[PDB]
Amino acid sequence: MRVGIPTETKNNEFRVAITPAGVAELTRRGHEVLIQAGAGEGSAITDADFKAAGAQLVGTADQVWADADLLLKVKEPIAAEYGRLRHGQILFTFLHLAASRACTDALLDSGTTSIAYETVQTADGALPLLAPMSEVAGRLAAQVGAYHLMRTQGGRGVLMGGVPGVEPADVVVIGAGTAGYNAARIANGMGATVTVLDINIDKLRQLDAEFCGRIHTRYSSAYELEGAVKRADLVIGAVLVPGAKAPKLVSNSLVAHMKPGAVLVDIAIDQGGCFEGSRPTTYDHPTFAVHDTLFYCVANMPASVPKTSTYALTNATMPYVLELADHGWRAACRSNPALAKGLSTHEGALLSERVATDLGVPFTEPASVLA
Amino acid sequence: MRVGIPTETKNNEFRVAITPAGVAELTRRGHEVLIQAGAGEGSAITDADFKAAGAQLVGTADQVWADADLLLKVKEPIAAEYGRLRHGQILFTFLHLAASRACTDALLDSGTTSIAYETVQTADGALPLLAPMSEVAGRLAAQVGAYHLMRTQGGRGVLMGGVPGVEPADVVVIGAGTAGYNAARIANGMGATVTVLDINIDKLRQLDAEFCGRIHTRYSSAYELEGAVKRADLVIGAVLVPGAKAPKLVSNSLVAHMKPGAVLVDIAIDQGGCFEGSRPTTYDHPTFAVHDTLFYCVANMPASVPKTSTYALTNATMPYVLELADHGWRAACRSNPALAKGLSTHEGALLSERVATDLGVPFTEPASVLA
Amino acid sequence: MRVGIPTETKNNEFRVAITPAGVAELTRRGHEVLIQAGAGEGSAITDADFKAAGAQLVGTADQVWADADLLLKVKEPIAAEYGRLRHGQILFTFLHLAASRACTDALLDSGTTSIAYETVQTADGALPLLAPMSEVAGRLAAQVGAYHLMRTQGGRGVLMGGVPGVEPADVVVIGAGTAGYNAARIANGMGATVTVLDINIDKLRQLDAEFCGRIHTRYSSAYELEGAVKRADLVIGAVLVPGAKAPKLVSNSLVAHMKPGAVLVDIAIDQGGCFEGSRPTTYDHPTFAVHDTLFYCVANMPASVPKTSTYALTNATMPYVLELADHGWRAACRSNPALAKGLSTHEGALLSERVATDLGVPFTEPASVLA
Amino acid sequence: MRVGIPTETKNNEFRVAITPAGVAELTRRGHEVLIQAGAGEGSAITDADFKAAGAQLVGTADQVWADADLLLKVKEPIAAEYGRLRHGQILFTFLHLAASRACTDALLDSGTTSIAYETVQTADGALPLLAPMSEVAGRLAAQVGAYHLMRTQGGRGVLMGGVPGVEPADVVVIGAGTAGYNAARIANGMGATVTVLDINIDKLRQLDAEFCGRIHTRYSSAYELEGAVKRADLVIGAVLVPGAKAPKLVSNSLVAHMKPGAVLVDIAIDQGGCFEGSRPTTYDHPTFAVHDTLFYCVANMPASVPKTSTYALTNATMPYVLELADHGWRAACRSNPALAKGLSTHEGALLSERVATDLGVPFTEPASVLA
Ligand SMILES: NC(=O)c1ccc[n+]([C@@H]2O[C@H](COP(=O)([O-])OP(=O)(O)OC[C@H]3O[C@@H](n4cnc5c(N)ncnc54)[C@H](O)[C@@H]3O)[C@@H](O)[C@H]2O)c1
Ligand SMILES: NC(=O)c1ccc[n+]([C@@H]2O[C@H](COP(=O)([O-])OP(=O)(O)OC[C@H]3O[C@@H](n4cnc5c(N)ncnc54)[C@H](O)[C@@H]3O)[C@@H](O)[C@H]2O)c1
Ligand SMILES: NC(=O)c1ccc[n+]([C@@H]2O[C@H](COP(=O)([O-])OP(=O)(O)OC[C@H]3O[C@@H](n4cnc5c(N)ncnc54)[C@H](O)[C@@H]3O)[C@@H](O)[C@H]2O)c1
Ligand SMILES: NC(=O)c1ccc[n+]([C@@H]2O[C@H](COP(=O)([O-])OP(=O)(O)OC[C@H]3O[C@@H](n4cnc5c(N)ncnc54)[C@H](O)[C@@H]3O)[C@@H](O)[C@H]2O)c1
């Protein structure tokens, strides 16, 4: 089997979907690894480091996409890449299909077989391949939120943690999962007063236990959500139902009642946004205004700390990459139920129910492709 | 007596030297309070809020400077203000005289009588008027340091706290006083591994006690400083000898051997900078490069979070402002040795020994002006 | 049924496989309990204490081995005990068969039926009978490691926790399971800077959550493993694949590049050792040298704190002892899949797959012995 | 002035009274530094390291003692060194004179001028040169106490921290000063339940605040002392009255009522011992028995971790060494009242009142030697 990794083309995307250690393991097992030259440059991995591990460097993107049986990526295919999608080829990357009909249609029309990092799910309900990017983004959201709270950046001009005698910032985190817990933890470490909302009370119990009383928890009812968002300096949206679109929890009329200069960071923007006003932005133009608040909506957040995120991602992905490479996609998916649950696309068939329900028709096929 | 507060004119300076509560106290005691129109706008204090407390609003800066016996500021007089300096007037603000020959010269030449906030010193050695601004700055340094470590900003692209399985950022703080303790505390809260250096072992003992083992402490010898700074992702300089220039502890050749994309935040920039390459910068152009590292040297740091810092500052200054207004400068200074230590300038005489020795001649007069 | 407990014969083994409370439960249910006189003396349990609970005291070891249907021990049979092994007898103890061809062969040849404490495994993957001994050994490892770091015992002469102004010891723990978590917790409590490595990222996540940032986590790749071990003063090997031999993770060539006087504690020595140079030692001669480092390799660790470890063990084992005594071995194993997983040996058949593949041939039989 | 450092001669004493950084400072100021060849070897400081800093290496001890105006040591002169004591020479070291009539007499008869590290005391009551050795010894006491609690070393066989479901060791620390606070902190970090006693309630308050409820505090009356010691597994004596002999707080009759295998560590053994049965031991024979308990009585404790303790000591002593070298002993003592408090001996006169009243006659002279 032939494994390809191309350079990420999305705006400011510095991650790469493999490191030399991973190349070494693949080649040890007799697979060939093709890598677009310069693909690891964002993450400070030279073409030479890749070579030394047994990779064949290739001059252009086109030659990675043709040739490769298993295409490993970080982000979803962008428009300019739709034409590179092949019929007898496995695509393994973050897809976020429920948020992009165009990407979904491009996968279905090309007949490619695709597996989403973010829907790979173990029996206990964890998402081990999203988890590490949720950790990075949760932590990032508190830092960038803290920074944009300065007057100098258009925020209301309060210091996260206050100083003795003077009140700290008021931070609300919607969602007590991986990203939410990490956002809350960092925000609390900077001295903010932190409140997190979720519909799952057990998630609130764990948070309550972990910090004794320090992080406040509220049940995420409409009343309770409005009360907290109204008073907040910084709101972080970190909500998920694993493969689904993402509920609109904060309306524009709500934001109209917020303190001027408040900042809202929508981690749930890949996947759709959990604020009504959310729209994907980029690291070049990260923010925009909604009634006197400032919105921060970068899809692709982990990309700005590639030294951390590249390693965090590939430590998690490799064992699945190896299962795919050794056994081919079906069989890997028959042996590994968590990998099966990541199956999204095959020969024009939409294999994920949540995506299908949210996208209107398509219509599912379950996993009678697994025969 | 007549108390004047003008609008701050330094770049991006949003603080104001008094709040309504302070105005009300002054007025209740029979003093007149003159305030430049719009002085509190940066801090969200309206001209109307100031009136309600008993202040006379004045259309121009010039009328505040002429007329006021006691002039309250936040920052030092800047060049455009040198001509406003008067002979029979008390100026109470942050001066940082050892770092500016020009400003010292202008104070001497005008015959003004000046008290520096930053050299008001209690018997125990504390600096109660600097302390709140060192708190804000120390906490800001960690925040802005974390942000500039993103590849997106020119930094090396590591997340402060790392994520499980991946190392965190390596933070070194030079100086374990108010600013350095606070920078250390926030850096630690964001999950960084933190080392602080000082020549004062007792300061190191306190920090060791407060965080059990969590914050590492190193005795600040040349060898220990070089070792730590070489390995650092973020270096925060927080050194002071109370009225003095500030030693150059980190040489350019040392920074030549640092990791590419490291960031150095020099909180000791007012006062002169403790890195050899430091130079005062502004919120409009905060950073610049030195051999592949990024330097951050905003004099003026607390200005960006005025909602926090204006209150933190005036909570501390008000009792001293009251002593000055009720009794006049000599007598206030005869009564309160902490105030006497802040005496910098009177009728062409330099009253501060540290400033004097550092500025070359001038030559001290001690406080036989207190008669 | 008749239950026998002999005196432990291994070097410095002070534990006993049962306490008076356990004897009393067995007796209440109509079983006979035979105990070698003096078996509880290492753990401060007198012959009289055992009598009061309903035990028959027996003068010699031989009479316990013959006579007893269920033989409860703490350690594996040693060579002088091979001749005591009988055909229609249940042996329940720590076995570690993958580390001893001889002990395995002796059980096979004797036809005895044996269940290993260390492979009794519940549905969630936990090893409830190993666990309390991993807690003791993990906590012991940090203690004894701390001690042998003194120059006086051959170590490099650094204090675990340092003192303010001076760096602490650098501790690496390989394996984030029960013993690793416990070693890290105590090492950290003593002020050391602690890094733990594992291939299981979820175990890294738990450890990151429990101590906030305080215990560092590193993904266990060969590169990360080398980096960390090279810099360490104390290395603790706590790696564990349930019934298997144990990977050699630290080569002799690697130890040759370690700081002189470093100490390596191999908790995984029962089971084979995870350092290349490891070899079982005893409490009489616990350490030996390997290239200027000091190895500590006591199989048997919990034996030195029997007041703690005898109770910790028997609190966990008793419910399983009761099921075996009441129902006999098959039936107990038919009803309790956790107990079935501990089945090692019966009438010349090796019942553990991991042991079988590690020992070369033998060849498995699965549990068609359960009929 | 000429400064000499000889090799420490006490049993297992691996510390050295100076480091290369200290030699370099002395040399820079125009002083001569003479060092016995091999003096730094216990602390891994080579003869070459000392040369590079400007030191003259000397072949024998005798030549350091003759020749040197200022003689810097770590331990007190031992008997084989009494003949080396000279008239016009400053001795600066740990003395513990109230515990040795012989050493005192030898200093008196020789006419030497001696300053004790342990009685150098600042205005606030702190002992800055003792302090770093009390930190090391306090942390060591918990480590070595933990170790000797193993049955394998004669202790009762309880693990410091217990394990879930089983009780931890019960630790009592007598004295809540530097060593006591440090012993408690490490004991607690290892999971023991820790009670500390002192007659100074404010020290009890500090310790209650620092650990919230976690470290128990008891007022040290005879009733409370007996109650706590009777129930303890580990007792640490850390009591300290600055220059005095040290009260016998724990009688032999009391130890007769202790649990068998209990361990008593007498940190206050330099200075005389605070247990009736205490007697100075060495690292070669650290322990002895007293009524079924085990006593640990190493005078000299910090010597086993010289990598830590040499730096901790010399970081504190250097500024005082510099004052002595530059100005000579009187003058240094006239300028620095803290140094004056360390004055012990001059031309046959005993200058310490506490030592004098404890040793019976001698008789004080105060510091009319300072003229
Ligand atoms: N592109 C990026 O920069 C990036 C990176 C990582 C994660 N994310 C996104 O962050 C979001 C959350 O990620 P995660 O891994 O923490 O998910 P998670 O599965 O761990 O947590 C989701 C949590 O949100 C909660 N939730 C669902 N509906 C809710 C509601 N109506 N009100 C309050 N809480 C609700 C759930 O109960 C759950 O506890 C996802 O949309 C994910 O895609 C984005
Ligand atoms: N303009 C601003 O944005 C701003 C605001 C606040 C404070 N500051 C500056 O921050 C600096 C720190 O102020 P602070 O209140 O924390 O001071 P502080 O007096 O409380 O502490 C300073 C510490 O530096 C240590 N130090 C002195 N010399 C040293 C050396 N050579 N090596 C290592 N440590 C040394 C001292 O021992 C002391 O503990 C000052 O320069 C102050 O002016 C700037
Ligand atoms: N005889 C004794 O004194 C004594 C007592 C108790 C336990 N032990 C030994 O301690 C060892 C650890 O036991 P435990 O109960 O903690 O086991 P555990 O299963 O709870 O955890 C072991 C950990 O090792 C990790 N691991 C496996 N392979 C790894 C790899 N190659 N790199 C890094 N990590 C890896 C696993 O992921 C797991 O998290 C076992 O060998 C056990 O027998 C010895
Ligand atoms: N040689 C060594 O290895 C070594 C090293 C360092 C310290 N020490 C010894 O440790 C002892 C403690 O030193 P330290 O630096 O912690 O002293 P310290 O002065 O900081 O504290 C000693 C404490 O003992 C308390 N104390 C005095 N009388 C008491 C009484 N009768 N009952 C209860 N508490 C009482 C004091 O109140 C004080 O808080 C000293 O003897 C010191 O010499 C030995």
Q: How is A69-107 classified by DSSP, letter by letter?
A: SEEE-SSPPPGGGGGG--TT-EEEE---GGG-HHHHHHH
Which residues from chain C sit within 8 angstroms of residue A315, using beta carbons? 201, 219, 221
Residue A16 backbone zone (phi > 0: left; psi -120 to 50: alpha; other: beta): beta
Kindly tell me the number of DSSP H helices and DSSP E strands found in chain D.
13, 15
Cα of D113 vs centre of ligand 4, distance in Å, is: 26
Q: Of A134, A24, A126, A5, whose CA–CA distance to A69 is shortest? A: A5
Pairing of strands B349-350, B343-346: antiparallel
- DSSP string for residues in A37-66: TTTTTTTT--HHHHHHHTEEEESSHHHHHT
Kindly tell me the number of DSSP H helices and DSSP E strands found in chain B.
13, 15
C29 known member of a binding site: no
Question: What are residue B100's phi and psi, to 5 degrees?
Answer: -135, 105
Rounded Cα distance between D345 and A222, Å, is: 80
Rounded Cα distance between B4 and C355, Å, is: 87
- Neighbouring chains of C at 3+ CB pairs under 8 Å are A, B, D
Lateral strand order in the sheet of A293-296: A216-219, A193-198, A170-174, A234-237, A263-266, A293-296, A287-290
Q: Of D312, D260, D286, whose CA–CA distance to D12 is shortest? A: D286
Coil, strand or helix: which one is B35? strand
Sign of CA dihedral C72, C75, C80, C85: positive
Cβ atoms of residues B292 and B258 within 8 Å:
yes
Q: What token pair was written down for D177?
A: 């000063």
Residue B208 identity (one-letter amino acid):
D
| Alpha helices per DSSP H over D97-234 | 101-110, 131-148, 178-189, 201-210, 222-231
Residue C243 CB contacts under 8 Å (≥ 6 apart), including other chains: C97, C98, C116, C118, C119, C352, C353, C354, C355
Rounded Cα distance between A218 and A199, Å, is: 9
Give the atom of ligand 3 at the shortest distance from the alpha carbon of C239: 24
Is C270 known to be catalytic? yes
Greatest pairwise CA separation for chain D in angstroms? 67
Rounded Cα distance between D95 and C76, Å, is: 55
Lateral strand order in the sheet of D70-72: D56-58, D32-36, D2-5, D70-72, D90-93, D113-116, D343-346, D349-350
Coil, strand or helix: which one is A281? strand
Residue D184 CB contacts under 8 Å (≥ 6 apart), including other chains: D138, D171, D173, D176, D194, D196, D207, D215
Rounded Cα distance between C50 and C311, Å, is: 15
Cβ atoms of residues B80 and B103 within 8 Å:
no
Which residues from chain B sit within 8 angstroms of residue A312, using beta carbons? 163, 165-166
Question: What are residue C36's phi and psi, to 5 degrees?
Answer: -60, 135
DSSP state, residue D286: -
Coil, strand or helix: which one is A218? strand
Residue A133 identity (one-letter amino acid):
M
Greatest pairwise CA separation for chain A in angstroms? 67
Cβ atoms of residues D247 and D153 within 8 Å:
no
Size of interface C-D (CB pairs under 8 A): 143
Q: Which residue of D has its CA nearest to C282?
A: D152
Tell me which architecture the domain covering B130-305 has in CATH: 3-Layer(aba) Sandwich (3.40)
Cβ atoms of residues B195 and B172 within 8 Å:
yes
Q: What token pair was written down for B258?
A: 């640092």
Coil, strand or helix: which one is B282? coil
Sequence ranges of the binding site of A for substrate: 15, 75
Q: What token pair was written down for D256?
A: 């007769």
Rounded Cα distance between A90 and A73, Å, is: 11
Q: Which residues of A39-62 are buried (b: 16+ CB within 10 A; e: fewer)?
A: bbebbbbebeebeebbbbebeebe
CB atoms near residue D253 (< 10 Å):
9
Cβ atoms of residues A180 and A238 within 8 Å:
yes
Residue B154 backbone zone (phi > 0: left; psi -120 to 50: alpha; other: beta): left
Rounded Cα distance between B62 and B9, Å, is: 13
Residue C3 CB contacts under 8 Å (≥ 6 apart), including other chains: C26, C31, C32, C33, C34, C68, C69, C70, C71, C72, C321, C325
Pairing of strands B263-266, B234-237: parallel
Give the atom of ligand 4 at the shortest distance from the alpha carbon of D180: 16
Is D96 known to be catalytic? yes
Q: What token pair was written down for B283?
A: 């919120």
The distance of Cα C28 from the centroid of its chain, to the nearest Å, equals 30
Q: Of D272, D267, D282, whose CA–CA distance to D234 is shortest? A: D267
Q: What token pair was written down for A265?
A: 């960071």
Cβ atoms of residues C182 and C135 within 8 Å:
yes
Nearest to B204 among C164, C167, C217 (CB): C164
- Neighbouring chains of B at 3+ CB pairs under 8 Å are A, C, D
Residue B118 identity (one-letter amino acid):
E
Residue A348 identity (one-letter amino acid):
G
CB atoms near residue D240 (< 10 Å):
23
Q: What token pair was written down for A199?
A: 């519909």
Does B1-129+306-371 match B130-305 in CATH topology? yes
Rounded Cα distance between A134 and A208, Å, is: 20
Cβ atoms of residues A128 and A120 within 8 Å:
yes
The distance of Cα C220 from the centroid of its chain, to the nearest Å, equals 23
At CA D210, angle to CA D207 and CA D212, rounded to 5? 95
Question: What are residue C102's phi and psi, to 5 degrees?
Answer: -65, -45
Nearest to C201 among A21, A210, A315 (CB): A315
Q: How far is B220 from chain D (nearest CA, A)?
A: 10
CB–CB of C216 and B161 under 8 A?
Answer: no
CB–CB of B143 and A147 under 8 A?
Answer: yes
Residue B224 CB contacts under 8 Å (≥ 6 apart), including other chains: B197, B218
Determine whether the shortest distance from the Cβ of A239 to ligand 1 is under 6 A.
yes
Q: Of D18, D89, B305, D311, whose CA–CA distance to A233 is shortest? A: B305
Cβ atoms of residues D22 and D311 within 8 Å:
no
Q: Where are the beta strands (DSSP E) in chain A?
A: 2-5, 32-36, 55-58, 70-72, 90-93, 113-116, 170-174, 193-198, 216-219, 234-237, 263-266, 287-290, 293-296, 343-346, 349-350
Residues D168-171: contacts with CB under 8 Å, at least 24 apart: D168/D192, D168/D193, D169/D193, D169/D233, D169/D234, D170/D195, D170/D231, D170/D232, D170/D233, D170/D234, D171/D142, D171/D145, D171/D195, D171/D232, D171/D233, D171/D234, D171/D235, D171/D236
Q: Locate tokens 């009289």: which residue?
A: C48
Q: What token pair was written down for B8?
A: 């701050």
Q: What token pair was written down for B26?
A: 């002054």
Q: Which residues of C275-312 are buried (b: 16+ CB within 10 A; e: fewer)?
A: bebbebbbbeebbeebeebbbbbbbbbbbbbbbbbbbb
Rounded Cα distance between C129 and C121, Å, is: 8
Pairing of strands D56-58, D32-36: parallel
Q: Which ligand is nearest to the CA of A313?
A: 1
Per-domain residue ranges of chain C: 1-129+306-371, 130-305
Rounded Cα distance between B286 and B281, Å, is: 5
HEC secondary structure over chain C: CEEEECCCCCCCCCCCCCCHHHHHHHHHCCCEEEEECCCCHHHCCCHHHHHHCCCEEECCHHHHHCCCCEEECCCCCCHHHHHHCCCCCEEEECCCHHHCHHHHHHHHHHCCEEEEHHHCCCCCCCCCCCHHHHHHHHHHHHHHHHHHCCHHHCCCCCCCCCECCECCCEEEEECCCHHHHHHHHHHHHCCCEEEEEECCHHHHHHHHHHCCCCCEEEECCHHHHHHHHHHCCEEEECCCCCCCCCCCCECHHHHCCCCCCCEEEEHHHHHHCCECCCCCEECCECEEEECCEEEECECCHHHHCHHHHHHHHHHHHHHHHHHHHHHCHHHHHHHCHHHHHCEEEECCEECCHHHHHHCCCCCECCCCCCC
Resolution in A: 2.6
Q: Which residues of D75-98 are buried (b: 16+ CB within 10 A; e: fewer)?
A: bbbeeebeebbbeebbbbbbbbbb
After which residues does chain B become discontinuous at a C–N distance over 2.5 Å?
Answer: none
Question: What are residue A56's phi and psi, to 5 degrees?
Answer: -90, 120
Question: What are residue A258's phi and psi, to 5 degrees?
Answer: -90, 160
Coil, strand or helix: which one is D359? coil
Pick the CATH number of B1-129+306-371 from 1.10.10.10, 3.40.50.720, 3.90.1170.40, 3.40.640.10: 3.40.50.720
Question: What are residue A189's phi and psi, to 5 degrees?
Answer: -65, -20
Coil, strand or helix: which one is A19? coil
Chains D and B, touching by 3 or more CB pairs within 8 angstroms: yes
Cβ atoms of residues A186 and B161 within 8 Å:
yes
CB atoms near residue A247 (< 10 Å):
14
Residue B99 CB contacts under 8 Å (≥ 6 apart), including other chains: B245, B246, B270, B271, B272
